[PDB]
mmCIF file of C-alpha atoms and ligand atoms in Angstrom:
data_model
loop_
_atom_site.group_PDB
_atom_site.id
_atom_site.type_symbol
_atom_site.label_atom_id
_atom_site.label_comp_id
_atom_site.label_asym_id
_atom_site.label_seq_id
_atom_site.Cartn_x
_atom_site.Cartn_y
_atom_site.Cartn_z
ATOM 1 C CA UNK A 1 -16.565 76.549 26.949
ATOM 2 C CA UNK A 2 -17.309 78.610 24.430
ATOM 3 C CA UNK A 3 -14.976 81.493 26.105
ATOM 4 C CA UNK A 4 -12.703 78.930 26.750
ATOM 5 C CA UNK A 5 -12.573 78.048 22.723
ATOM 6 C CA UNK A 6 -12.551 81.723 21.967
ATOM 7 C CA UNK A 7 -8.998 82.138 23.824
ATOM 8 C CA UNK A 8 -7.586 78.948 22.604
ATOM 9 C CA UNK A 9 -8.357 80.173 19.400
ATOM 10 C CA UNK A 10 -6.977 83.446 19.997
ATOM 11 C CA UNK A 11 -3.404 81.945 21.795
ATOM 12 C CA UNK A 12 -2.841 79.928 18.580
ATOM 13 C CA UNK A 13 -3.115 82.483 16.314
ATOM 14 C CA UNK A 14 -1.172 84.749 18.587
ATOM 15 C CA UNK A 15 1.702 82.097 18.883
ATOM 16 C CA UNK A 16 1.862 81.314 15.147
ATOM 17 C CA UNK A 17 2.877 85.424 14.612
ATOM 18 C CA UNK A 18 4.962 85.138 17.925
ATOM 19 C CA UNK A 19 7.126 82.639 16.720
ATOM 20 C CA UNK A 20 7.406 84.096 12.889
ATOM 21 C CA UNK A 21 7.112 87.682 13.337
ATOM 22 C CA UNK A 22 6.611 89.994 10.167
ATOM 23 C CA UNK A 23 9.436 92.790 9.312
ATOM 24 C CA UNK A 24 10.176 95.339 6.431
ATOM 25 C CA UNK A 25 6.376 95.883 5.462
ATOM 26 C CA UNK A 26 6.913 99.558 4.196
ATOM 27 C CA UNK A 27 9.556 102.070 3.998
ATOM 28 C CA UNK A 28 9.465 105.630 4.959
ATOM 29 C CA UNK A 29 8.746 107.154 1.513
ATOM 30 C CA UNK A 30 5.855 105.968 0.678
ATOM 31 C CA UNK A 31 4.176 108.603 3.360
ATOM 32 C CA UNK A 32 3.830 111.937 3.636
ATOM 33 C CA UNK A 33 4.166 113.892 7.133
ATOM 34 C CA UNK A 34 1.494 115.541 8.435
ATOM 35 C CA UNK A 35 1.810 116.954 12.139
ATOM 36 C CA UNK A 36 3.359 115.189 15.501
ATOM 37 C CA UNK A 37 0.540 113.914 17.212
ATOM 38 C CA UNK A 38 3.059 113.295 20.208
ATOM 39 C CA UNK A 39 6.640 113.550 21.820
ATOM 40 C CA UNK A 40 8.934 112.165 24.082
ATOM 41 C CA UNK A 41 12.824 111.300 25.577
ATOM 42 C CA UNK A 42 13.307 109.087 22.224
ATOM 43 C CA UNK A 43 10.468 108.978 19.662
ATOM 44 C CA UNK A 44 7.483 110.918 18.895
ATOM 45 C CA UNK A 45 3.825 109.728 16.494
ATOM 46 C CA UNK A 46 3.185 111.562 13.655
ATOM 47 C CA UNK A 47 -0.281 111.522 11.599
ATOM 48 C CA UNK A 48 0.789 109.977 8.037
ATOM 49 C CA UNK A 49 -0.331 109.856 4.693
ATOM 50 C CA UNK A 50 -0.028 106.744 2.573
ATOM 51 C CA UNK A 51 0.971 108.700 -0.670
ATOM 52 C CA UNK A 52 -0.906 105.778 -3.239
ATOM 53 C CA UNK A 53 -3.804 104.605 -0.733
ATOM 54 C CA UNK A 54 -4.429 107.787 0.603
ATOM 55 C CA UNK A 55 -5.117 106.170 4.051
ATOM 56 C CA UNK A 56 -3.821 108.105 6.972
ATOM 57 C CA UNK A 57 -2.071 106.506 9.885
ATOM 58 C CA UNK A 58 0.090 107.192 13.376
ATOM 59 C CA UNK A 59 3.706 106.913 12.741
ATOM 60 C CA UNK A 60 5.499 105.985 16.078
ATOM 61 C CA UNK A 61 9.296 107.164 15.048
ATOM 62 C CA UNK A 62 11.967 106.057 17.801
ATOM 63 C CA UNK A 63 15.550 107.121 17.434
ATOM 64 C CA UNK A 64 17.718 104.522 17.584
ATOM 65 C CA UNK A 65 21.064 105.838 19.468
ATOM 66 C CA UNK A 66 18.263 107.076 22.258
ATOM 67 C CA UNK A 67 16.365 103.783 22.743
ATOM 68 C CA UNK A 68 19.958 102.504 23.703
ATOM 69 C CA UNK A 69 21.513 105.453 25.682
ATOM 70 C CA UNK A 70 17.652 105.478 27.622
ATOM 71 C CA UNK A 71 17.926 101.140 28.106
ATOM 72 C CA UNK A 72 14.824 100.510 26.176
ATOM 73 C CA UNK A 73 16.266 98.299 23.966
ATOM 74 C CA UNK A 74 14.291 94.794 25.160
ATOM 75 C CA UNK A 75 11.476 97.012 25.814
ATOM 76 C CA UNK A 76 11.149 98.560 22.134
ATOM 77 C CA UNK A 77 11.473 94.702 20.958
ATOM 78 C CA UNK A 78 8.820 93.696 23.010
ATOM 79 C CA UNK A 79 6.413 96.431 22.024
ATOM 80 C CA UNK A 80 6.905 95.587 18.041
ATOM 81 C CA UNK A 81 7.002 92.037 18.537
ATOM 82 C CA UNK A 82 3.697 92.228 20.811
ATOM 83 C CA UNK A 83 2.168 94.409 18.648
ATOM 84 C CA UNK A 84 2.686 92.366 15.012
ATOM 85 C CA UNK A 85 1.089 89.573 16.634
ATOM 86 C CA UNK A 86 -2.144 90.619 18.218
ATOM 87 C CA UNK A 87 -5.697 90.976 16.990
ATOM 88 C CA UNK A 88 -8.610 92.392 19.398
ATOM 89 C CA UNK A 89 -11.318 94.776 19.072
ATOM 90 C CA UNK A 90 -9.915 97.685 21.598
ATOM 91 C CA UNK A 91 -5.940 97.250 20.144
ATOM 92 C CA UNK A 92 -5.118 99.937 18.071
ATOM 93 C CA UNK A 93 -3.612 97.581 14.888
ATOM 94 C CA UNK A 94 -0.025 97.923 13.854
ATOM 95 C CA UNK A 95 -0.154 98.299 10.206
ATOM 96 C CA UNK A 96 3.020 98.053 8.620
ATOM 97 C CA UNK A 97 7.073 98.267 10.228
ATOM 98 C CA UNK A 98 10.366 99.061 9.506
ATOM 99 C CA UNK A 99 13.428 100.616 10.319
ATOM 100 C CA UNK A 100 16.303 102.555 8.561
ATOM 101 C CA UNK A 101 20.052 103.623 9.880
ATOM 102 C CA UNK A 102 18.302 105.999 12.550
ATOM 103 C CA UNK A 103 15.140 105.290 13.499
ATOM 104 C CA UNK A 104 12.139 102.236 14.241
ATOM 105 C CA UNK A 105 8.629 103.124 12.535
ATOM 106 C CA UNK A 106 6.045 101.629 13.525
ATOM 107 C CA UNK A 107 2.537 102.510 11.540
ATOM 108 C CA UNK A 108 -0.267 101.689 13.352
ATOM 109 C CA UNK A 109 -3.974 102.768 12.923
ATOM 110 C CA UNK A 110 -5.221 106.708 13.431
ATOM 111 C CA UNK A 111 -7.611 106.988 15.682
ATOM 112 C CA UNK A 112 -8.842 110.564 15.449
ATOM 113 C CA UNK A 113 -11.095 111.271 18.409
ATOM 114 C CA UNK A 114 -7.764 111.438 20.621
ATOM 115 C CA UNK A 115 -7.127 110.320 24.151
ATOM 116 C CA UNK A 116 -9.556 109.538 26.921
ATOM 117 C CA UNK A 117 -7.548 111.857 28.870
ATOM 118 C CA UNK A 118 -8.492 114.796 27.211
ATOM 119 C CA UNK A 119 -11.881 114.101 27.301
ATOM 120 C CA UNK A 120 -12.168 113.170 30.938
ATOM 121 C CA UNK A 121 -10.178 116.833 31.765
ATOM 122 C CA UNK A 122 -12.619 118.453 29.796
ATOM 123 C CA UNK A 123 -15.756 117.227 31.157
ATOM 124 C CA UNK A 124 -14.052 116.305 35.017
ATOM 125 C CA UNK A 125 -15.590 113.074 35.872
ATOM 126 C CA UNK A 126 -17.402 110.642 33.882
ATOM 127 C CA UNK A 127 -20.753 109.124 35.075
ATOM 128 C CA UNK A 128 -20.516 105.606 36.344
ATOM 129 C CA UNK A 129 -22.351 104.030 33.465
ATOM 130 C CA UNK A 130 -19.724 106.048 31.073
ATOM 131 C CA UNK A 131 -16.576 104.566 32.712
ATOM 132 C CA UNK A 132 -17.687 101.471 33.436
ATOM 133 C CA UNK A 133 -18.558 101.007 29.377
ATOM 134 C CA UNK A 134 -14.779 101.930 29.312
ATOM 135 C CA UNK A 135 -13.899 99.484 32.144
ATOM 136 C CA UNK A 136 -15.317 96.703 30.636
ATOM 137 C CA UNK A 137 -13.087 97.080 27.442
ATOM 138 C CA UNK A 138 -10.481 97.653 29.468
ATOM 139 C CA UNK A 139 -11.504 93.740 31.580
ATOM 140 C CA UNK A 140 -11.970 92.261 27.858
ATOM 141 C CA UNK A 141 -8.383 93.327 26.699
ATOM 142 C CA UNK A 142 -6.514 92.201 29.941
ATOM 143 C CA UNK A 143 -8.365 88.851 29.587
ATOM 144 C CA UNK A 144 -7.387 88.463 25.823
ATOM 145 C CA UNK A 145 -3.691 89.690 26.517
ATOM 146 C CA UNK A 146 -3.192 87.535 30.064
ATOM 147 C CA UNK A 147 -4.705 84.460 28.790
ATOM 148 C CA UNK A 148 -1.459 85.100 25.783
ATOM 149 C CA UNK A 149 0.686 85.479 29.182
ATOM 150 C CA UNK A 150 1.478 89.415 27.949
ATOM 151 C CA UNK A 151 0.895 92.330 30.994
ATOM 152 C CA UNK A 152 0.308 94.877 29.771
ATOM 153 C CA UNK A 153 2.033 97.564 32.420
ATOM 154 C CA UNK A 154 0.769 101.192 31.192
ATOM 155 C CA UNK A 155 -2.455 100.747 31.627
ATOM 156 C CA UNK A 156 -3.148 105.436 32.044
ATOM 157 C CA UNK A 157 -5.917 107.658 30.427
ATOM 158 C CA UNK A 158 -3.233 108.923 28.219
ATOM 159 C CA UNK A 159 -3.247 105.417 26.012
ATOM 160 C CA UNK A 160 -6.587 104.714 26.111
ATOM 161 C CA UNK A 161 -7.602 106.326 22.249
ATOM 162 C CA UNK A 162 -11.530 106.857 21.626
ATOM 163 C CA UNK A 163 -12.341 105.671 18.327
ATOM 164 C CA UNK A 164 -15.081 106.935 15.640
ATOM 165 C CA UNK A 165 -17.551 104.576 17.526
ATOM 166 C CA UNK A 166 -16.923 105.767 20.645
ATOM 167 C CA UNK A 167 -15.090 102.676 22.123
ATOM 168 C CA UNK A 168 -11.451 102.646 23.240
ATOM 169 C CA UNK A 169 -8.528 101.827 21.023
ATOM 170 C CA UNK A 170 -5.543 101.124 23.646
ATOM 171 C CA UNK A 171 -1.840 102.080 22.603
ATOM 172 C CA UNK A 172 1.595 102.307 23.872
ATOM 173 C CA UNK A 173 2.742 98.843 24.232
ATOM 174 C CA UNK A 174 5.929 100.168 24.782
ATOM 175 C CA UNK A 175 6.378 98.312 28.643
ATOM 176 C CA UNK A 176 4.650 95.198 27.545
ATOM 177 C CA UNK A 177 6.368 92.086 27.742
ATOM 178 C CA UNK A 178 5.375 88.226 27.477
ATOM 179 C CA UNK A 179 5.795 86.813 31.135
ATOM 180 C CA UNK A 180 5.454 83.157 32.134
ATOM 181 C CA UNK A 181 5.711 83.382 36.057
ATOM 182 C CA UNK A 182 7.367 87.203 37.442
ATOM 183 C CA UNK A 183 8.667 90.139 35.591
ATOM 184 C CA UNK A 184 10.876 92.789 37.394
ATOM 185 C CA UNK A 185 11.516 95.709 35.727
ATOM 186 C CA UNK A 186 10.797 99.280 37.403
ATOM 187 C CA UNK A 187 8.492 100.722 34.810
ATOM 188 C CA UNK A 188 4.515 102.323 34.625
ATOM 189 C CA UNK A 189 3.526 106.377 35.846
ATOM 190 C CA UNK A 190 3.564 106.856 39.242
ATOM 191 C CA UNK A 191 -0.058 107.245 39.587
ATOM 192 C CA UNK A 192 -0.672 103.666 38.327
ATOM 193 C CA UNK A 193 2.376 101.465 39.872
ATOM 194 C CA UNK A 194 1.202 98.692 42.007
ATOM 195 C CA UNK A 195 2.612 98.620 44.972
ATOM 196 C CA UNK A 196 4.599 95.606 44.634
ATOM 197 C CA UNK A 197 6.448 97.657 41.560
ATOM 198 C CA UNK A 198 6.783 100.268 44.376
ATOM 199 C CA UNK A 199 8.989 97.814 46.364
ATOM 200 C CA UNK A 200 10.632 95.904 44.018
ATOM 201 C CA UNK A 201 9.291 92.653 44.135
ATOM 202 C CA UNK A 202 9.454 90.253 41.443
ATOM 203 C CA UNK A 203 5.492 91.088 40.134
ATOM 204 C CA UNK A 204 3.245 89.639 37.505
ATOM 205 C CA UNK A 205 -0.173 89.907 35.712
ATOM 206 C CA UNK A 206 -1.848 91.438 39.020
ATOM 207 C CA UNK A 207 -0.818 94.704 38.270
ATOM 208 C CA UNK A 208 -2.890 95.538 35.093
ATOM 209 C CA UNK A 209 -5.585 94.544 37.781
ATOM 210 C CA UNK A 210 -4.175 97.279 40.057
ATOM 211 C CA UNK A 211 -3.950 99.588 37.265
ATOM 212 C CA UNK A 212 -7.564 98.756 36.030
ATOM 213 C CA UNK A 213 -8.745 100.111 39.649
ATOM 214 C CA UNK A 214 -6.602 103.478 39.515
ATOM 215 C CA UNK A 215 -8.375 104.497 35.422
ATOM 216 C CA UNK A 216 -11.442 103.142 37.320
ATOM 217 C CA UNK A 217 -11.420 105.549 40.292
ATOM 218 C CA UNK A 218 -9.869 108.197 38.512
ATOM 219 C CA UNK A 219 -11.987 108.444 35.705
ATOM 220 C CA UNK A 220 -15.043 108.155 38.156
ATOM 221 C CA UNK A 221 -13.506 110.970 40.099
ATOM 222 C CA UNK A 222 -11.562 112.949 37.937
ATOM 223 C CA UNK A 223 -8.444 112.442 39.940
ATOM 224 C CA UNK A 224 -6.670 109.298 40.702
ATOM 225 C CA UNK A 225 -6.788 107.763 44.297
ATOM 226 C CA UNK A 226 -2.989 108.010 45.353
ATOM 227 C CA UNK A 227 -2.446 111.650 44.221
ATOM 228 C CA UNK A 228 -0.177 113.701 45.742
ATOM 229 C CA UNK A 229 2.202 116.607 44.291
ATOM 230 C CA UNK A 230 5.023 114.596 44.922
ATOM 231 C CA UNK A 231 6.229 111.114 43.271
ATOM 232 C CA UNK A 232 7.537 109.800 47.010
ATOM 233 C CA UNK A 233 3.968 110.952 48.535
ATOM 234 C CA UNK A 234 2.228 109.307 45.756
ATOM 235 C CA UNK A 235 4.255 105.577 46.558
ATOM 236 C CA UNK A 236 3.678 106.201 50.513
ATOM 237 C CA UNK A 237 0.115 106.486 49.973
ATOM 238 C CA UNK A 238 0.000 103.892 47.160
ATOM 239 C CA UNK A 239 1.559 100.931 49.682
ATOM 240 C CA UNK A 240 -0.110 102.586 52.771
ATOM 241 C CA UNK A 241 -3.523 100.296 52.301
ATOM 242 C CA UNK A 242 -5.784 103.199 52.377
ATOM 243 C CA UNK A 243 -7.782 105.032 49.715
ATOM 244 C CA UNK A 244 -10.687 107.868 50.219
ATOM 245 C CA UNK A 245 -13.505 107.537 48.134
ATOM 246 C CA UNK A 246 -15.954 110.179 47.361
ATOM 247 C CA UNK A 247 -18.940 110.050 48.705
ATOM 248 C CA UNK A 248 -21.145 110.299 44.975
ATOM 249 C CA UNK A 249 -19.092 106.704 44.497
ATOM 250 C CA UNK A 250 -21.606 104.346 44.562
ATOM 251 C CA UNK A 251 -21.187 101.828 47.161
ATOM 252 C CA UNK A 252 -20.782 99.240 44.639
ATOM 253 C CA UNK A 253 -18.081 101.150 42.707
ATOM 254 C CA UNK A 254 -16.350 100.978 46.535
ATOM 255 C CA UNK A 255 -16.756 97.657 47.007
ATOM 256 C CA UNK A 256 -14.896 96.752 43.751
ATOM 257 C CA UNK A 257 -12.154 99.078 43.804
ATOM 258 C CA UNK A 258 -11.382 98.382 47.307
ATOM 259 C CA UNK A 259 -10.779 94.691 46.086
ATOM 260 C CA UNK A 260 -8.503 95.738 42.854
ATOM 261 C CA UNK A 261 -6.390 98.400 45.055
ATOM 262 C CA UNK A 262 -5.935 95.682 47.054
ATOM 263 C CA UNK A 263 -2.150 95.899 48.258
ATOM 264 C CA UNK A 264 -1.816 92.097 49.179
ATOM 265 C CA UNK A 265 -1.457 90.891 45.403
ATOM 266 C CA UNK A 266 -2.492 87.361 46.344
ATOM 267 C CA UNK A 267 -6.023 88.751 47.654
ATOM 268 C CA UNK A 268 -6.217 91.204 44.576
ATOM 269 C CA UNK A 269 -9.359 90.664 42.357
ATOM 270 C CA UNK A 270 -8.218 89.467 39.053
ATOM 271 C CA UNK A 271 -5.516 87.189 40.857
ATOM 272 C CA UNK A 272 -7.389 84.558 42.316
ATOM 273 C CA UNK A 273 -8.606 81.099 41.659
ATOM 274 C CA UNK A 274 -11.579 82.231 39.535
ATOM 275 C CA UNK A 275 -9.895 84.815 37.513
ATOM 276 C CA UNK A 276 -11.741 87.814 35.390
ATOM 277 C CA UNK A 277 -14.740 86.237 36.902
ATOM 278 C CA UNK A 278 -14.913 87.714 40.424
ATOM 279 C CA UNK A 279 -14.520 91.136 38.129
ATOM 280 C CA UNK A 280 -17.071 90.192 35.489
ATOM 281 C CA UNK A 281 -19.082 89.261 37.870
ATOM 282 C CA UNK A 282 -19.224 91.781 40.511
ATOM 283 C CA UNK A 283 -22.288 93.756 41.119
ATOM 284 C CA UNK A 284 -20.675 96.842 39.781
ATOM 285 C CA UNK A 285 -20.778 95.181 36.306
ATOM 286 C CA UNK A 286 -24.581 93.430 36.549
ATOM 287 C CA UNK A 287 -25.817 95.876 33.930
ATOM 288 C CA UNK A 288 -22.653 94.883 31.411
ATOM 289 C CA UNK A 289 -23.623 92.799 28.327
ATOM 290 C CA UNK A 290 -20.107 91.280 28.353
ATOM 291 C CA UNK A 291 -20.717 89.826 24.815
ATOM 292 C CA UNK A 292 -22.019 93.021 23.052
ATOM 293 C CA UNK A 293 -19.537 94.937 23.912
ATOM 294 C CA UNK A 294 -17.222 93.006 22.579
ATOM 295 C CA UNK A 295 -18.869 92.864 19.447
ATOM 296 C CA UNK A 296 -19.397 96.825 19.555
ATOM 297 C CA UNK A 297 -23.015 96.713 19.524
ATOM 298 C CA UNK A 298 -23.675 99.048 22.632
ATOM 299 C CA UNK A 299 -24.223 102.168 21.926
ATOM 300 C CA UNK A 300 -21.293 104.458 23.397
ATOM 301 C CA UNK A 301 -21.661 106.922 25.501
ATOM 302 C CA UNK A 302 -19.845 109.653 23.705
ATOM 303 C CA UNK A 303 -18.929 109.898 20.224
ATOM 304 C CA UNK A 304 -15.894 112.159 19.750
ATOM 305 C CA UNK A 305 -16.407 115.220 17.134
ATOM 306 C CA UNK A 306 -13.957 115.549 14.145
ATOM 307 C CA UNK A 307 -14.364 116.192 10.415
ATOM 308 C CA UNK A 308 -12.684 113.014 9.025
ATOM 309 C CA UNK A 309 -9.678 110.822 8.982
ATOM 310 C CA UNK A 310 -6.685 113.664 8.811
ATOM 311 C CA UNK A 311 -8.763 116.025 11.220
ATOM 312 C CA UNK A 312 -6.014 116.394 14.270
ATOM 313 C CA UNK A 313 -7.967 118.697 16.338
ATOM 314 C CA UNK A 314 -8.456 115.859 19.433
ATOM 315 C CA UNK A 315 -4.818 116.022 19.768
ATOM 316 C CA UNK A 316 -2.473 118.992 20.815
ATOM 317 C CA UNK A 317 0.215 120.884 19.435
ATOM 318 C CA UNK A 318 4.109 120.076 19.265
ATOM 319 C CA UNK A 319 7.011 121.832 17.671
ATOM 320 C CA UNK A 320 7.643 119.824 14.265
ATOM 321 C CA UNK A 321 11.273 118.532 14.121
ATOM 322 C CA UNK A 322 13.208 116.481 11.429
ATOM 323 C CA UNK A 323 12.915 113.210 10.516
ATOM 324 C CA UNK A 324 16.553 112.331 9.794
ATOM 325 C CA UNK A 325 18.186 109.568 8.836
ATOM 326 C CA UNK A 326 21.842 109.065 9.248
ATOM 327 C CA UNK A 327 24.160 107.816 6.162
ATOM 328 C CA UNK A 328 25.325 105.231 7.992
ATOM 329 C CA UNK A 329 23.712 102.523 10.192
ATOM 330 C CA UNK A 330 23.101 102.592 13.708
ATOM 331 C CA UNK A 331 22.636 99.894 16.322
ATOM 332 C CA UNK A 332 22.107 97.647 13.666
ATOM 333 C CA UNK A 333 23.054 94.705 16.386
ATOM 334 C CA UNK A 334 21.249 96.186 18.580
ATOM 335 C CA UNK A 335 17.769 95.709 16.486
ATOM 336 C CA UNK A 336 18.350 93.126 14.248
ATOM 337 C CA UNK A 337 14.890 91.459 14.928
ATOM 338 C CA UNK A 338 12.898 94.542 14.940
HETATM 339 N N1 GAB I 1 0.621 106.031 20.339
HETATM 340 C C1 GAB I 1 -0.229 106.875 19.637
HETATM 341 C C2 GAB I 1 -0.247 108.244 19.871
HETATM 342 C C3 GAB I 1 -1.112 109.072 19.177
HETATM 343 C C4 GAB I 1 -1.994 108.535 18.247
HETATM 344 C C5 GAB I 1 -1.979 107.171 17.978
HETATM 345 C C6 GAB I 1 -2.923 106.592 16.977
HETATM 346 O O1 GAB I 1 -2.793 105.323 16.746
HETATM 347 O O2 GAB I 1 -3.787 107.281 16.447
HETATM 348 C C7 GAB I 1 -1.104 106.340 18.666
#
């Protein structure tokens, strides 16, 4: 019950910042630029400085004229709206938004000690107690977001931030959606897509679960279980039904992962009658303090090294472009809610 008031809790105050979402909470000249923390097809992040607070902060810019040309319209919605109304311990926190004739900003929190990724290339594997502290706030965040009826959908190593504590800060909402019932949009890396994605069913919440076994595998591995050099090899062997494990996996580790990359969604863990449970409660997790990790009182296993809140060192290196913004509107229409 006391879970069960927890999420209650959480869906009303979710709903009441659904349903009356915040806009225009800062414009762009009240920060400074520092460096791009990140690029792609239509926006980029940028570490910030608040020019009167001081605070520093991850400015996601996306260009207008290409979130329409690329069809991410709905999607770039979704991500704002999404993000302006959530509140959980592994969320990074969207600070302030806005947009101007070009572009959408969205300012969320820096978190310095960069992306799980990097880390997990730069050791090769983690051990199992390391990703499964990592798992398990991964398992709190998809309960907190399903129980809102949000998937997540980019669940990859690369969005998965590591935070001055040690824990992960997850980012990129940029495919998540609020889904009573199916969703059908082709969307994800190919690494991660569940297998209905693959084939074009109409798909719901069960694929975070899918995805949750990929990061799982992958970042006990240091590879993910579907790889291949090609993106067709990679969906024949994700809907195939087979998956190698290596033989330091413990046979626990197996025995859950087997039942997340489960191809038949409806025997998927996470998707049946009990829920989170059958993954809370797996043997794989019997050493998991669900509780304290939620309230960050574990003690992580690896506490990323920087020198303070502007220290970009975690992240890599991109050629700095403009940030400019047109004398005239664009796609105002287009992003009138935003
Ligand atoms: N999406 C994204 C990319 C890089 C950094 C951050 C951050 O919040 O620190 C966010």
């Amino acid at each position: 019950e006391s879970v069960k008031e927890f999420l209650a809790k959480a869906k009303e105050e979710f709903l009441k910042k659904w349903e009356s979402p915040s806009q225009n909470t800062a414009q762009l000249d009240h920060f400074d630029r520092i460096k791009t923390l990140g690029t792609g097809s239509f926006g980029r992040v940028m570490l910030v400085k608040h020019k009167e607070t001081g605070n520093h902060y991850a400015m996601k810019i996306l260009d207008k004229q290409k979130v329409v040309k690329l069809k991410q319209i709905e999607h770039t919605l979704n991500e704002k709206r999404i993000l302006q109304a959530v509140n959980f311990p592994f969320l990074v926190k969207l600070e302030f938004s806005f947009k101007d004739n070009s572009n959408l900003y969205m300012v969320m929190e820096y978190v310095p000690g960069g992306e799980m990724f990097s880390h997990l290339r730069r050791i090769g594997r983690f051990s199992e107690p390391h990703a499964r502290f990592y798992a398990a706030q991964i398992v709190l965040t998809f309960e907190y977001l399903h129980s809102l009826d949000l998937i997540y959908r980019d669940l990859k190593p690369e969005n998965l931030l590591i935070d001055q504590q040690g824990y992960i800060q997850v980012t990129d909402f940029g495919f998540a959606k609020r889904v009573k019932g199916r969703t059908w949009t082709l969307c994800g890396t190919p690494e991660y897509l569940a297998p209905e994605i693959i084939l074009s069913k109409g798909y719901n919440k069960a694929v975070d679960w899918w995805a949750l076994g990929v990061l799982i595998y992958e970042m006990a591995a240091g590879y993910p279980p579907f790889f291949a050099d090609q993106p067709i090899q990679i969906y024949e062997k994700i809907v195939s039904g087979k998956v190698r494990f290596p033989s330091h996996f413990s046979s626990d580790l197996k025995d859950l992962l087997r039942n997340l990359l489960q191809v038949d969604l409806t025997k998927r863990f996470g998707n049946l009658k009990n829920g989170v449970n059958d993954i809370k409660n797996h043997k794989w997790f019997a050493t998991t303090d669900w509780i304290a990790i939620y309230q960050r009182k574990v003690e992580a296993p690896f506490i990323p090294k920087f020198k303070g809140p502007g220290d970009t060192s975690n992240f890599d290196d991109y050629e700095e472009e403009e940030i400019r913004v047109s004398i005239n509107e664009k796609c105002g229409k287009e992003f009138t809610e935003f």
